[PDB]
Enzyme design. Structure first.
Site, PDB file in Angstrom:
ATOM      1  N   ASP A   1       0.697  -1.297   0.210  1.00 54.34           N
ATOM      2  CA  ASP A   1      -0.037  -0.003   0.082  1.00 54.34           C
ATOM      3  C   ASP A   1       0.629   1.114  -0.053  1.00 54.34           C
ATOM      4  O   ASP A   1       0.346   2.260  -0.465  1.00 54.34           O
ATOM      5  CB  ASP A   1      -0.958  -0.291   1.271  1.00 54.34           C
TER       6      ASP A   1
ATOM      7  N   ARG B   1      -6.250  19.990  23.335  1.00 55.02           N
ATOM      8  CA  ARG B   1      -4.965  19.941  23.864  1.00 55.02           C
ATOM      9  C   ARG B   1      -4.606  18.461  23.809  1.00 55.02           C
ATOM     10  O   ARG B   1      -5.362  17.809  24.556  1.00 55.02           O
ATOM     11  CB  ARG B   1      -4.655  20.535  25.294  1.00 55.02           C
TER      12      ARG B   1
ATOM     13  N   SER C   1     -11.183   4.979   3.037  1.00 60.38           N
ATOM     14  CA  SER C   1     -10.454   3.962   2.945  1.00 60.38           C
ATOM     15  C   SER C   1      -9.126   4.214   3.849  1.00 60.38           C
ATOM     16  O   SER C   1      -8.340   3.083   4.186  1.00 60.38           O
ATOM     17  CB  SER C   1      -9.747   3.829   1.445  1.00 60.38           C
TER      18      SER C   1
ATOM     19  N   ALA D   1      -6.168   2.537   8.481  1.00 54.80           N
ATOM     20  CA  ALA D   1      -4.665   2.912   8.405  1.00 54.80           C
ATOM     21  C   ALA D   1      -4.423   3.480  10.000  1.00 54.80           C
ATOM     22  O   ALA D   1      -4.817   2.666  11.158  1.00 54.80           O
ATOM     23  CB  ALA D   1      -4.322   3.415   7.455  1.00 54.80           C
ATOM     24  N   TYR D   2      -3.902   4.716  10.029  1.00 53.79           N
ATOM     25  CA  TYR D   2      -3.725   5.345  11.215  1.00 53.79           C
ATOM     26  C   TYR D   2      -4.826   5.426  12.186  1.00 53.79           C
ATOM     27  O   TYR D   2      -4.821   5.241  13.478  1.00 53.79           O
ATOM     28  CB  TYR D   2      -3.013   6.814  11.159  1.00 53.79           C
TER      29      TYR D   2
ATOM     30  N   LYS E   1      -7.393   3.628  12.639  1.00 54.14           N
ATOM     31  CA  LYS E   1      -7.839   2.545  13.397  1.00 54.14           C
ATOM     32  C   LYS E   1      -7.127   2.577  14.506  1.00 54.14           C
ATOM     33  O   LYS E   1      -7.408   1.944  15.758  1.00 54.14           O
ATOM     34  CB  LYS E   1      -7.662   1.191  12.478  1.00 54.14           C
TER      35      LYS E   1
END
Ligand SMILES: [N-]=[N+]=NCCn1c(Br)nc2c(N)ncnc21
Ligand SMILES: [N-]=[N+]=NCCn1c(Br)nc2c(N)ncnc21
Ligand SMILES: [N-]=[N+]=NCCn1c(Br)nc2c(N)ncnc21
Ligand SMILES: [N-]=[N+]=NCCn1c(Br)nc2c(N)ncnc21
Lengths: 261, 261, 261, 261
Positions: D45, D145, D155, D159-160, D162
């Site tokens: 990916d 903060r 889509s 990635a991050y 999750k």
């Protein structure tokens, strides 16, 4: 000495039990399930929990040992292939012992009842909303609204407590850990959110606000308690004692169970 | 005896410092910022952390005390309105002391460096991906991929550790707590997820897999360390000592700070 | 036109209801609780939910409006002080309407039953362990073990779904969101962990593995269903319609409720 | 038509690329990496993301296709063993196409710069504390903060997003999702905590309070931006187009990647 073996009840466990009994008959060992000094659990951690609760009044005179006939357990942490070696080393005696902290739960009514938990004790509502005032060492800490609360032992932290976001605690730490189930938080209702780790002698009290009926669990057992005035949690003065026959570190047991084995 | 006062530096804190100094001059008290036995922090918990690190080599000869000129702090937990009463009771001496555990961090290269943390120590990557092998008591526990990791003291659990999902631990428990920052978990990469509470003498080691450069923080201070071979965490043998002049329980301090005050 | 007013039942709500009815009598407005075209809820979001379910068969012919006599609600989002202005603008008619998606729940046995939820529908076990196979568009996604599961509407995401870690979704998005309650994850049991957002026409099916008895909730109502073969979730083709008389953005409503007001 | 192939650069990917090129030479296909209409990514990916960003100005004239030479990817979701079948069906043309939403990021200074993200865009501080005011559709939502914030595409939610607790969104939903990194919450500082799902045309603006310097990432690329006045997020009007040659459902792709394959 005196000993007994409990089984999960399937063929695997029942036949392993009969074979350790046969093996034990080659030694100065007496089967006695009334006043044993060794309790062998064959099955899973659920079989072990029933063994613990079957004998929770003679905890100081018993060393427990668990054998897993299915997947690895945190209490049933020895393989059936080590049954023969287990029989020999238990029979000779002179093994070392390890102790884990326990959780005392007191329930008061308008008498009172006490329970020992090896894993955890949970409180939930009887059907309606769950609201309790949470009191730590007689100081009001928070008004909890949610699905319920859970108080874990250190060895219990790898069970329900883990599913609720709690920390995993090495069982040499004498402590208890309170986790929340689905707390509601807004501008008018406020809970701490974080799990809470309490030392020995700290008393955590749950006091009802409206409904006085609660579903209270201690390990596997769950009972609807009616007209509850208070639920008190503290680290028990009693401990569970294990027979130790080799090194199987807690963190290694955590690794084998949750990372890979 | 000997004492010093550090200030956050705004008018409020500077003027409160000059007024306690004036108050102290009415007693057998000497201002000495080289070898004090009392260190008074005026400001917030950040002012207190700098005071702690300013004198971290004479920890066993110092009792710390913190005054919050802004919101309530977990270390700066006394109000300016109690400054006068604080001067009198510190001058008379004969106050009780309380000790909190500390975290030792060792960084090894290809020499080595040690640090004391009062709150926490965190490791992150220098710019690329963060991957370390996590080793507990010389046993490989997991291969961590994520943003970083954080090791907290008990009193530190209410700081960064709380923002990462860790448990709040009463500071009478000698322990450290490891929390994850944004771990990636899939079918090929696996972390424990849960915070981990370690007792005294347990050693947690972070070992690089690819990049050997890490951004390492200890409390407020963060430095890029290059060619790192190992980061070791353990509960320090040293403790921070506070002057105790009345009862302000940790759980009450947690309540005032996160529930309502 | 025709209209009705439901009340929470306390003095505040009952007296506000009688005063809007009196106000409505100054217009071409008929009180009819059999076939109303306007349903006014006076109380909280729980009062509104009962109003919605009281008339869930005439949803396409009704515009709902909610007044909060306590704290601000996400459905009961108008103040009692605006009752008089509400009567006048509803009577004149020619107001704009806004529609929110709904959740359809189908329960099949060995007939079948369908339900509409405005907030969410949850499934839990009848007493023992909760295990279901989760099937998305006829493809087996996971075997869930835990306390239960929750399927939320977009407007429902600020209710139970929020307490379970789900995302807050603007209600203009036609979707449903599945959250987990206390899933167990280890080396042998595996759930996705993350909330799941499904679009229109995606069907999520819950299929039993052992016990066929489940406690199923739809908004406020919870019933033990026996001999369940399947629970199906999908975004309903029906929508709830609100009377719109000024701008109160969803995100502002989220802010007022969870940040400050 | 015209096409190009990008490779991760290892032997496996480079040799697979040369063999598809050789296969393509048996058809009316021209290699052109300036104005291709098909972009084939061979690797993971990350290789696909570089391909997307290499051609992000001709998105409406390109159908992308990704081949994973390592583990399964969410964009590189076809096996090398299907390369030959891929060449034949791409050459014949007349394949169906699927479109995924994208995230537009605008950064304003005291000119301005816009970016397209396929996965996510994140904002963090340059070194000190991270504080921004979060504004939704010109209404002030919260003062954040913490460590930073992340805005995900559908889509990109796997990635991050999750790793930060966000929901997984089917990519047919035109939306963006904001997640928090390690927010501090107490009695004086308050964030929503929950992920936030925004529809098309909703604008989310990040406005500085003290420091105006931010580390801003878009997919793989991260750059320190100085003297920032505003960061604006919205669902892009542009979409990424994939060549579709068989059925590989998103939820099945989620299952294969996080449950088992
Ligand atoms: N959950 N789950 N799996 C059931 C086994 N289980 C029992 Br029963 N007790 C424990 C424990 N103390 N730690 C971890 N798993 C445990
Ligand atoms: N986060 N935040 N707020 C800053 C203050 N802060 C410091 Br500096 N140290 C601590 C601590 N030990 N517990 C709680 N807050 C703390
Ligand atoms: N939880 N809590 N508070 C009870 C009010 N409540 C109801 Br009832 N429905 C909703 C909703 N859709 N969003 C937010 N709060 C709601
Ligand atoms: N995290 N992790 N693994 C790296 C692969 N990765 C990339 Br690069 N993009 C995605 C995506 N959109 N979903 C899931 N994984 C992805």
């Amino acid at each position: 000495m005196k000993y007994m073996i409990t089984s999960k009840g399937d063929e695997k466990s029942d036949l392993l039990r009969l074979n350790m009994i046969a093996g034990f008959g080659e030694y100065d060992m007496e089967y006695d399930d009334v006043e044993p000094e060794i309790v062998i659990s064959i099955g899973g951690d659920g079989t072990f929990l029933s063994a613990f609760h079957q004998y929770e009044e003679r905890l100081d005179e018993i060393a427990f040992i668990g054998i897993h006939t299915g997947h690895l357990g945190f209490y049933a942490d020895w393989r059936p292939a080590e049954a023969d070696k287990l029989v020999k080393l238990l029979a000779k005696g002179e093994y070392q012992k390890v102790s884990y902290p326990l959780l005392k739960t007191t329930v008061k009514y308008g008498k009172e009842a006490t329970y020992l938990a090896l894993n955890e004790s949970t409180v939930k509502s009887s059907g309606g909303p769950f609201v309790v005032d949470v009191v730590i060492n007689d100081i009001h800490f928070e008004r909890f609204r949610g699905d319920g609360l859970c108080m874990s032992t250190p060895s219990g932290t790898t069970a329900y407590n883990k599913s609720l976001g709690g920390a995993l605690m090495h069982p040499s730490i004498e402590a208890m850990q309170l986790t929340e189930m689905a707390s509601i938080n807004n501008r008018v209702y406020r809970t701490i959110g974080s799990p809470l780790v309490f030392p020995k002698h700290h008393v955590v009290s749950l006091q009802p606000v409206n409904d006085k009926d609660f579903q209270i669990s201690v390990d596997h057992l769950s009972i609807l308690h009616r007209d509850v005035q208070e639920i008190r949690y503290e680290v028990s003065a009693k401990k569970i004692h294990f027979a130790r026959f080799r090194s199987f570190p807690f963190w290694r047991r955590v690794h084998d169970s949750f990372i890979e084995d």
